[PDB]
């Protein structure tokens, strides 16, 4: 660790690691989104637990590793995911802090 | 109730700025990249649109920005000539080219 | 016209940011994917520059920030070396890689 | 026209991603000031509302967010109690507190 | 001018100003139009020529000076207006760089 | 629950960026307020902190940013002199007077 590490412009950028990291996991979302307005799926796109739920149809379960993003935060292995019925998504069960085990003391 | 969300109202309401902010980045990233050649018309950013650099005589022609594709009845496409006076306007004007309306 | 129109004057504004964003985006993005291994010199933003992790003896050179690229007198990178006391400072410095002046 | 304009486009497209930021920037700035107080419940930004810091059996209730003033069909107020467990979930849920719909 | 002006801390701030001044007015445009949301007026309120028109009756003529944004580009004293009408706002006209003598060479 | 929910868990993520960008905004806007005036010292961002325009023998001193609060161990401000060379560098250094560690 240097003064590199401890000057103004590092302690910036690092303080919004987690900003950008989402924001880009946004982005990615809303694009995924628009590439695919013309296909009209049962369950539209969503995003919750910080996570896109790319569109999708009736019995349909997706499933996707925990947010990257807070994996320094993960006490264990873990996944979560989502039901497109016919009634659009189920809720997201188990959610993130449950399924991966989120920590910060 | 999970389209009702509030984390979904957050994020759906602001697809439009987080496809228009890539757009404009991308844009950016574009006109860097080329700015060592020095055209007669440089690059800009019109009717939220990216238009190349570009020599006179040319026409630039691109799609309707696709972050307004629920809007449109149809696909159309946006153009631009340079000219020794510099970019024109677009044609047709982006209401007509694109068929864009709101209820 | 449309070179001086306020839909281009904004977004030439905005270009530095935008730039700048995308940049420390990819360092962060670099520096996630990275996290599994523990380097020496681990990843840092200085000079509005990513510095990716890197181990002792290794000396990072990138070109001097593109954004800026007006503002350059000369084609420069910059560099900053690994040793076992961490990261070096940049060199040459900024100014002088770089061939940095406002005009 | 001028509504159609793409300018105007931009910016209501964006409008309540502006009125999101703002409130949020307000919570962050309220959070920091009090941060020497060290309450039961630290503050929490929940159903994009703002919850102040606050004591056991405290129970705040402010109005449900103006951003969506648009899509309600009343006033209505969203409350949290504050517990020696932690913040209670919102009553009543968004959805109903505020008469929220989209067509 | 000293090592503080030319430091990338301070260079990464200037090169942004202008895009914090023309955000900043966005805000209050958005905020301003949301506080009026319950009056329903003639034309309702819009943003261009990087400028806020608030909501308007028909017959009125907003006049504002040229974003302050660009003081310093300006080579002449100057403002810009819009008028409400029976079937909505007018043009902007004259616009920015006419009204406001904007310049950069 | 509430507290652990991912709603909070973005905001207080992104906390930081924006109390930084709150006072990015109140710093661009004080210059241009004072744009008309021309100090000795001009206006200038350093150290995460805006150092309001100034003239020869002034000192500025603000409170550490209040948004690294929590990695404090002290009551800290910053201090810089206006100079006829200009600004001085921050005194005393960042990580000393504002007593600043990473736990």
Redesign the interface.
Known sequence: ????????????????????????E??K???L??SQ?EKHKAC?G?????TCWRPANVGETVTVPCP?????FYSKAGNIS?NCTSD?????FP???DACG?SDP
Chains 1, 5 share one sequence.
Do not use: P
């Not at 590490?5 to 880009?24: A, C, K, P, V, W």
């Not at 969503?46 to 910080?50: A, K, P």
């Not at 990257?68 to 320094?72: E, Q």
């Open positions: 660790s240097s003064g590199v590490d401890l000057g103004t412009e590092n302690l910036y950028f690092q303080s919004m690691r987690f900003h950008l990291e989402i924001q880009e946004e982005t979302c809303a694009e989104l628009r307005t539209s969503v995003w919750d637990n910080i990257k993003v807070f994996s320094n989502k659009g998504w189920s809720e997201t959610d993130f802090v989120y």
